[PDB]
Scaffold this active site. Sequence first.
Site, PDB file in Angstrom:
ATOM      1  N   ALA A 254     115.942  11.957 -40.108  1.00  0.00           N
ATOM      2  CA  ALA A 254     117.066  11.778 -40.810  1.00  0.00           C
ATOM      3  C   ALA A 254     116.856  11.476 -42.208  1.00  0.00           C
ATOM      4  CB  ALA A 254     118.100  10.817 -40.055  1.00  0.00           C
TER       5      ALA A 254
ATOM      6  N   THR B 181     119.406  17.916 -33.601  1.00  0.00           N
ATOM      7  CA  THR B 181     119.832  18.924 -34.329  1.00  0.00           C
ATOM      8  C   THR B 181     119.684  20.156 -33.810  1.00  0.00           C
ATOM      9  OG1 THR B 181     119.199  17.473 -36.242  1.00  0.00           O
ATOM     10  CG2 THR B 181     119.615  19.638 -36.708  1.00  0.00           C
TER      11      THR B 181
HETATM   12  C1  LIG Z   1     118.860  16.421 -34.202  1.00  0.00           C
HETATM   13  C2  LIG Z   1     120.054  15.702 -33.856  1.00  0.00           C
HETATM   14  C3  LIG Z   1     117.681  16.034 -33.136  1.00  0.00           C
HETATM   15  O1  LIG Z   1     117.518  14.561 -33.357  1.00  0.00           O
HETATM   16  C4  LIG Z   1     118.325  16.548 -35.717  1.00  0.00           C
HETATM   17  O2  LIG Z   1     117.083  16.852 -35.721  1.00  0.00           O
HETATM   18  C5  LIG Z   1     118.769  15.299 -36.538  1.00  0.00           C
HETATM   19  C6  LIG Z   1     118.765  15.772 -37.901  1.00  0.00           C
HETATM   20  C7  LIG Z   1     119.442  15.029 -39.077  1.00  0.00           C
HETATM   21  C8  LIG Z   1     120.315  13.622 -38.688  1.00  0.00           C
HETATM   22  C9  LIG Z   1     120.610  13.169 -39.560  1.00  0.00           C
HETATM   23  C10 LIG Z   1     120.710  13.421 -41.159  1.00  0.00           C
HETATM   24  C11 LIG Z   1     119.968  14.456 -41.456  1.00  0.00           C
HETATM   25  C12 LIG Z   1     119.428  15.465 -40.491  1.00  0.00           C
HETATM   26  N1  LIG Z   1     117.706  14.296 -36.208  1.00  0.00           N
HETATM   27  C13 LIG Z   1     117.903  12.862 -35.973  1.00  0.00           C
HETATM   28  O3  LIG Z   1     119.237  12.413 -35.836  1.00  0.00           O
HETATM   29  C14 LIG Z   1     116.968  11.858 -35.898  1.00  0.00           C
HETATM   30  C15 LIG Z   1     116.081  11.921 -34.714  1.00  0.00           C
HETATM   31  C16 LIG Z   1     114.704  11.671 -34.799  1.00  0.00           C
HETATM   32  C17 LIG Z   1     114.171  10.177 -34.669  1.00  0.00           C
HETATM   33  C18 LIG Z   1     112.867   9.708 -35.481  1.00  0.00           C
HETATM   34  C19 LIG Z   1     112.010  10.673 -35.912  1.00  0.00           C
HETATM   35  O4  LIG Z   1     110.743  10.267 -36.126  1.00  0.00           O
HETATM   36  C20 LIG Z   1     109.652  10.753 -35.369  1.00  0.00           C
HETATM   37  C21 LIG Z   1     112.508  12.089 -35.938  1.00  0.00           C
HETATM   38  C22 LIG Z   1     113.710  12.293 -35.539  1.00  0.00           C
HETATM   39  N2  LIG Z   1     117.375  10.413 -35.912  1.00  0.00           N
HETATM   40  C23 LIG Z   1     117.076   9.569 -36.992  1.00  0.00           C
HETATM   41  O5  LIG Z   1     116.372   9.780 -37.903  1.00  0.00           O
HETATM   42  C24 LIG Z   1     117.442   8.172 -36.947  1.00  0.00           C
HETATM   43  C25 LIG Z   1     118.946   8.206 -37.758  1.00  0.00           C
HETATM   44  N3  LIG Z   1     116.802   7.240 -37.555  1.00  0.00           N
HETATM   45  C26 LIG Z   1     115.771   6.624 -36.979  1.00  0.00           C
HETATM   46  O6  LIG Z   1     115.545   6.761 -35.663  1.00  0.00           O
HETATM   47  C27 LIG Z   1     114.737   5.663 -37.431  1.00  0.00           C
HETATM   48  N4  LIG Z   1     113.356   6.012 -37.315  1.00  0.00           N
HETATM   49  C28 LIG Z   1     112.829   6.863 -38.574  1.00  0.00           C
HETATM   50  C29 LIG Z   1     111.377   7.119 -38.511  1.00  0.00           C
HETATM   51  O7  LIG Z   1     110.721   5.820 -38.339  1.00  0.00           O
HETATM   52  C30 LIG Z   1     111.056   5.031 -36.898  1.00  0.00           C
HETATM   53  C31 LIG Z   1     112.617   4.802 -37.166  1.00  0.00           C
END
Ligand SMILES: *[C@@](C)(CO)[C@](*)(O)[C@H](Cc1ccccc1)NC(=O)[C@H](Cc1ccc(OC)cc1)NC(=O)[C@H](C)NC(=O)CN1CCOCC1
Lengths: 201, 216, 202, 202, 204, 220, 196, 196, 213
Positions: A49, A1
Amino acid sequence: TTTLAFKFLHGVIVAADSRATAGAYIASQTVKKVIEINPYLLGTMAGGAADCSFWERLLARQCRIYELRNKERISVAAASKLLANMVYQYKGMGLSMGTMICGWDKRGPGLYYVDSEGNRISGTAFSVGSGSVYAYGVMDRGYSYDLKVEEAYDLARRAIYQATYRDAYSGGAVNLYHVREDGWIRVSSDNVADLHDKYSS
Amino acid sequence: TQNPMVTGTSVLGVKFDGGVVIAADMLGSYGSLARFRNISRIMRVNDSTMLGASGDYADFQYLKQVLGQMVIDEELLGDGHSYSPRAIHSWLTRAMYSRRSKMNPLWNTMVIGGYADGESFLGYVDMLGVAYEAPSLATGYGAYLAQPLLREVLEKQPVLSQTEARELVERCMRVLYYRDARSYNRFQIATVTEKGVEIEGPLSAQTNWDIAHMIS
Amino acid sequence: TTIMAVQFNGGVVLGADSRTTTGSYIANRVTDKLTPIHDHIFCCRSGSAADTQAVADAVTYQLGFHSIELNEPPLVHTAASLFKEMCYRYREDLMAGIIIAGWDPQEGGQVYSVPMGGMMVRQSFAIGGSGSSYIYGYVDATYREGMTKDECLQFTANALALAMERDGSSGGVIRLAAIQESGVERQVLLGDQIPKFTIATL
Amino acid sequence: TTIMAVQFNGGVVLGADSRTTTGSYIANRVTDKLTPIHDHIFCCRSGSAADTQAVADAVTYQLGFHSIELNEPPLVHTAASLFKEMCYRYREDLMAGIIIAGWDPQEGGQVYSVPMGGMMVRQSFAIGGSGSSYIYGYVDATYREGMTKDECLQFTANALALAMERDGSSGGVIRLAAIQESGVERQVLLGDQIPKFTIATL
Amino acid sequence: SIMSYNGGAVMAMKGKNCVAIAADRRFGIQAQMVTTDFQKIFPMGDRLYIGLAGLATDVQTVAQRLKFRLNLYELKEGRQIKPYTLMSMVANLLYEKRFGPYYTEPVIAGLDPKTFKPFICSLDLIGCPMVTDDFVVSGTCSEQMYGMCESLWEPNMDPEHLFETISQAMLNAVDRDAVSGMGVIVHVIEKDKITTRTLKARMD
Amino acid sequence: TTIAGVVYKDGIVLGADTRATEGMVVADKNCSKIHFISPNIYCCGAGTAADTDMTTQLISSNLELHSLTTGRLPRVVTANRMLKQMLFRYQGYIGAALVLGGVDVTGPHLYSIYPHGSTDKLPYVTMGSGSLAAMAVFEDKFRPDMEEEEAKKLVSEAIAAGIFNDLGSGSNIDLCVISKSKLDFLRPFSVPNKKGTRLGRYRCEKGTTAVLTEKVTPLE
Amino acid sequence: MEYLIGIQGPDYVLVASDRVAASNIVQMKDDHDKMFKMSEKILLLCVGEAGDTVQFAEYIQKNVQLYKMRNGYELSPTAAANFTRRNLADCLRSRTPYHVNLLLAGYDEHEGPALYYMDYLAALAKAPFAAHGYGAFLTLSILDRYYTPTISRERAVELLRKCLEELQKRFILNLPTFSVRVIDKDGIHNLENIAF
Amino acid sequence: MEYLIGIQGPDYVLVASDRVAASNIVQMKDDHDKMFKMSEKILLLCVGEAGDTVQFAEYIQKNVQLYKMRNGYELSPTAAANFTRRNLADCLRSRTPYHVNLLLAGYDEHEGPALYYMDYLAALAKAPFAAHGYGAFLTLSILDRYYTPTISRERAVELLRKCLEELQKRFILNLPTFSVRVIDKDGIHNLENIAF
Amino acid sequence: RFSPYAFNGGTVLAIAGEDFSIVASDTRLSEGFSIHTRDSPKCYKLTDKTVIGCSGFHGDCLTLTKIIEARLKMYKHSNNKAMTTGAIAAMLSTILYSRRFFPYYVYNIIGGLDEEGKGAVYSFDPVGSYQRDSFKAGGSASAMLQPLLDNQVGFKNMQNVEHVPLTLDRAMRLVKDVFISAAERDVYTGDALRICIVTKEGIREETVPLRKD
Ligand SMILES: *[C@@](C)(CO)[C@](*)(O)[C@H](Cc1ccccc1)NC(=O)[C@H](Cc1ccc(OC)cc1)NC(=O)[C@H](C)NC(=O)CN1CCOCC1
Ligand SMILES: *[C@@](C)(CO)[C@](*)(O)[C@H](Cc1ccccc1)NC(=O)[C@H](Cc1ccc(OC)cc1)NC(=O)[C@H](C)NC(=O)CN1CCOCC1
Ligand SMILES: *[C@@](C)(CO)[C@](*)(O)[C@H](Cc1ccccc1)NC(=O)[C@H](Cc1ccc(OC)cc1)NC(=O)[C@H](C)NC(=O)CN1CCOCC1
Ligand SMILES: *[C@@](C)(CO)[C@](*)(O)[C@H](Cc1ccccc1)NC(=O)[C@H](Cc1ccc(OC)cc1)NC(=O)[C@H](C)NC(=O)CN1CCOCC1
């Protein structure tokens, strides 16, 4: 993000990107990262997310109940304090979310940064996300409290664009919100590819 | 169960025209030691369904006790309703996943066979709650040795007679004894049919060892 | 340990060594591993000294009350079932390899094995403990269908002596117990009495 | 594995199972574990297939040269010493359990044990491999001072049969070899030929 | 992942009497982009190219050490190198570092001298040759590139149709990878000419 | 991989699949796993793909150097010794599971060689991720001294069993038939698997991509 | 933590670095120089590990000087950067790997102004502008914003000043002074040290 | 990283804290107030881990205020410090321990000025002067050198300035501004924020 | 210790049109290097208007489906109406987040009709993060299916193509082609392709064979 928010003479500008990643893989390019809590209150999303989506929707529920019970809009301070307390109970458990709470209050323009770590600070300008370091640079250089409405739009729009240029985990489109005294308005949703065309000329 | 102790190896199953046949050797291995050479790893659930279990034998004895009571409880009411093979399969998926989710798994891999209302049933259940139906099933090393042979035959001939299915199992149990080091040349054959569930006494597979002399 | 129980016609024969180890030190060189649970029911204990003891003491309490309430001489299977329940429920906490052997007026002489997992199986003869590893070959070669009581006593004594000979965590004294309708009779073998199989090399 | 070698007046008898495993899978169910080094010297291999194979190849090379350089039939002890020198030197690298049994026209029948440590000791008879653990009691009870060639053949065949029954890492086919001044005679025991011991419980 | 540290993607495609080789232009360290014009495809002999994907150092170290050996070859021999010969040379170079390899999976695209026959191949980090008649890919978006090529590639393509295919295959794959992009350069190698084009791409 | 070998009445029949993997993705749909050692000896390979290629080449090189000096046909035992001792020297760090087959003046010989350097002399052998599936066919259908076409059928069915039951293996079946009289290297012996015919039209029409920079360099 | 920056124009290369030498929590030196003179027209700005920085940069420095004495002329900026990269790449898999992130700036007789970025892994890249250190994360976006290839040297200093002022506002580490130097056809020029 | 300092005089307590809220490498806030008003004469200077600082400080804050309302009169500086120590020490071995290092400054109607030092482990210690954070290492020695028990407040601010200037000179972290407050008989007084 | 998860492979796909919605999946269930069954379609119907597709750990997929069905009736009993596609998608998010600290190893894709009869697709992550999109892939082969769809359905990266509305025929061909392409490279994908089609009148099923290796 990358997300950013700054307050000035005419209100509060809220900007965000639309990229979502799962490792190196780009999951989505059309994510709405600014959540609409109230006709006057907003919240940005950065980090996990599902974490950002769940807890800020929980807040939207919390704020509405508050409105029904007290016959009055919740303050920006009170809305930020509720989320700070909800997310603090889960400290060290794995939750990852960096949010900004923007709105117009009885006290005027309101801006708070709330962490899953447990931070809650008010400020004039913030940048939250993986590309936040890049947005901070361009925002601070072209910032003035006396900025014209349209000039503040291009500042926030450019600051996210510049972040998407350097950060791998930022991109898609730049979405813009403007918090006025009578409520926020939805400004524009500009694709990064289209902005590259404009800023090169 | 965090650490299995006395364990049973492969369990086989293939459905034919008329019912289902299941096979399992009568060994309880304690690591590399073949400790208990005469134990039944197949149980009759009711008139229409049976079960063969791989892995920890003590955990199997638990499930045998629980299912044992469930069938007794139904036959008490005498309302004309009884558990279908698909129902026992469904229940077992719920039980195994429940324990998996409690981080205290029942260390087992089951094969459910049954015959109800014309069609024959064959179902698989993990220690994690992975369940599915298949015309042929094999657990443990059977998956790597027997199942390939079972699938090859069903490719050429989808429907089998009881005899053809039975002698196929004979062939599969022979391979398992050659290649699996935790097996034993003493097995049971269990069969579901319109008549009911039959489990047959100690059976041995005939082995060939001619390849000993042709090395040089 | 090494422990052993053999079933004959009118009852059972139990046998155990007498060694208790705390690492490589024999804490008790003359241990009674044959524990009485009821009048005709015994158990052989191997594994953790504290664990097996506690289970034994709980089964004695449980079977004691059960027998009085049922007004019958307790079933060997019942005593074995009380061991199973405990050894299975607390299998992750206990280190117990039990052999339950005894007599009852309904089914006669019975030998049940409860290994570390908590399973239960009836056997003609059972062996357990660390020392039982070295005597699987002998026990399978020597055992015969329908042995007399006096032969079963010789059979257990021979197997144990061979096991104590090889196993470091086994030794001392052979303790034997015979249980039939008439009751329980105990004997102990010392030094010379242990069946000598001479040191067999050049 | 289970491997075995027995000594008599005229020479030696050697026995081995035929199972080789890669974990739980049997890679070769009919292996020849008895490896000829010279005309009258064999070795029984247990442990790592590749390690024991390389040592055997190198000893055969060394002794082969040694015997020609002395112009004299090679001593069993000399062959066993060449195993000792390698097994001891590379003890941290090799997983080897070797029994060296043979005949030479100076000492006659000889059975040497070179276990994992790399030590060497001469014995009347020796057992090795994972499966050998289950037959110590039997071997200690059956062995007699002054067994004939035919008696040694049956003795080693019986012990292996009992080992293959209980050990998962053992099984398949019994391989026997008799060495004397006459030469080397080898036979193979298949399915039914294996000494039948009935599985007896209840 | 060591391969995911710098990112990048290299693709090669076979045409009628031609071959195309494309790569992304990003040079970045993890999340941060550093340079928007990084060279990954290198000329080895006029009508023969090599594209290297992986760790940016090893991309450069292999490219230079291969040219070292190739120049000595083309001087020792009186001829210019053949596509199969280069492939075996690269495999040789990479296997020398078997137990401590260069973290780069190369892709070779070119036309055979005299016979003008098209040639494409990809290799391991330890140098395993894999020749195909359709396409070879290497990089962080391996899966993304495969999905594009399988559905787009056609048997006989003229230089223009081949260019449109490799360009579209690279662009759409790169757009689903975070550590790849910032421009795509494509080389179309024909017997008489070489066409080099940088494409209009996303810069996020 | 799945690789197999068998000894029949006249000689040796070797088999292999044509799939190579990178992680859990198919890297090569048509791979050559049956390797040239000498005109009379061939060797199937499984494990680390590069280790399979280079080991088999080095020994093929050493044997050619050996046969040129002796002036006679190389032996399978020589190939076996050269492979066994080398793999042992590397303590299994060279991941090469091998099936070695050939015909000597001694006759037909078949070997399985492990990465650690252990060799098995057998009438039928299987190596690779789909070896157990292939072995199940050999244990079910093998008979001593089969005819040429019967053995060709047996090995191809063994490789197929690996192909369809193991995720690490797939695509075509390759055979190599070696006898005292004849050598037959049947590369595409069987094509059991085929890609489905494309239904949609995804032709990227000319000028569908936007170009920023163009340079055309003329050649000789 | 250390900082490097480089801005290339049409006929010059502008470079700057902080003058802070720190140990855990204390600033031990106030006037530290992170710039190494290679030739009359080449500078090597070296940053990273405590021991490796001085040892590596100095080794390349004396080798270029040896080249000057050996052949009578100086190395080109392109040849210098490749020489530094080769020595770093070779040591990468050896027993003594140098953990140095460096930046080479030079002016060539025929090719003109040149700026090279280099990883500690020894990845060489030519850029119009580049930065090292944590401070790079805050400044690089400002460079992307206000840069044209046709930037004059006096406006390049203003651009540099915009970057250094951002390090006072947002960067948590105290960096008061910066060494500023320009390279052109006349050689290396000392500029007024930017202080806060 | 955060810094606290307190200096007790004959009839006053001078306290100061930096106004910097930092996230890894960036300064997020320019004017972060780290002092919490407990009573009309008591300040709680709280520093430490992310969420624990505000959660713990406000809990004591609202409980001290609850004591005011419940009884009419206020808690003494000593009574407040022990109340704060009890809450921290009871959480020390609990499920949720608060990672906070704090300074308690107050004026009493009987015993006068008092400064309390408290470890995150909840060790209470009364001192004439105290400091927290990495800055404490560079400032406690100056405080040892120039402090007298009869120090006038005008000369105490001068002593405070010496310490803050040392942080600008030696301390690696950029702390430009500091909050400055005095507590005496008349209550809590706000002073001009010392800036650099 | 003990792993409470297993990767069973499988890929789900969904395309939203004007009056239709296609939910497609391969039918292979895997574990390690062997196949459990060749007949395991991942797409499952929930109402007359909604179809769900689950990939990943089959243990969780089975459980989660059984939870959804129960909840559908619970809603039906209380509110006297069938649950809408959006309401199912919103509910699934809460069900998945309830297990935030013990995640369902699950990739869900919901396809169906919205309240105006238009095609709707919802994509999910393991912990409940979701959005509405026009087309999405999820599973072992999602990285292979997506880039082609972004090009063909999304018209991205092409210069001059007027955005022609999706037809049922063209979308069906596109679905079949990407899975055929996936079966070539991903080892977890193959055997057969199951396709669910949601329109005004019920749900239709179609099955095309794939590579079996
Ligand atoms: C930018 C792209 C950096 O990653 C943003 O922070 C973005 C924010 C956002 C995106 C969609 C909706 C609302 C806000 N973050 C992500 O896209 C995020 C990256 C991330 C991965 C894992 C994390 O846990 C420590 C933290 C950040 N992506 C996701 O959440 C993806 C869609 N889902 C997963 O990876 C599933 N995970 C969740 C945590 O447990 C393990 C599996
Ligand atoms: C033979 C000797 C060894 O296997 C028997 O099993 C014997 C059983 C026995 C002993 C006394 C009375 C009846 C039956 N076992 C022991 O003597 C036993 C060995 C053992 C130690 C720890 C174990 O893990 C739980 C399992 C077996 N020795 C003891 O119990 C002695 C008295 N206590 C200790 O060694 C103290 N231990 C307890 C566990 O933690 C380390 C210290
Ligand atoms: C019985 C079967 C097992 O104890 C015998 O000792 C037998 C000895 C034998 C085999 C062939 C020819 C002559 C004699 N041993 C084996 O079959 C042996 C078991 C073993 C494996 C690894 C060891 O440590 C290095 C020690 C013993 N099997 C093998 O060597 C097989 C062919 N190879 C592997 O298992 C490969 N291993 C190497 C070690 O790391 C894991 C994979
Ligand atoms: C089947 C396909 C296994 O799934 C066969 O064993 C095959 C053997 C073969 C294929 C082509 C040509 C000759 C022989 N093996 C592979 O395809 C192999 C799978 C594998 C991956 C990693 C390994 O760990 C060391 C071992 C086996 N694939 C490869 O060698 C691929 C092309 N290379 C890589 O994955 C890169 N590796 C090389 C080894 O070091 C780690 C990185």
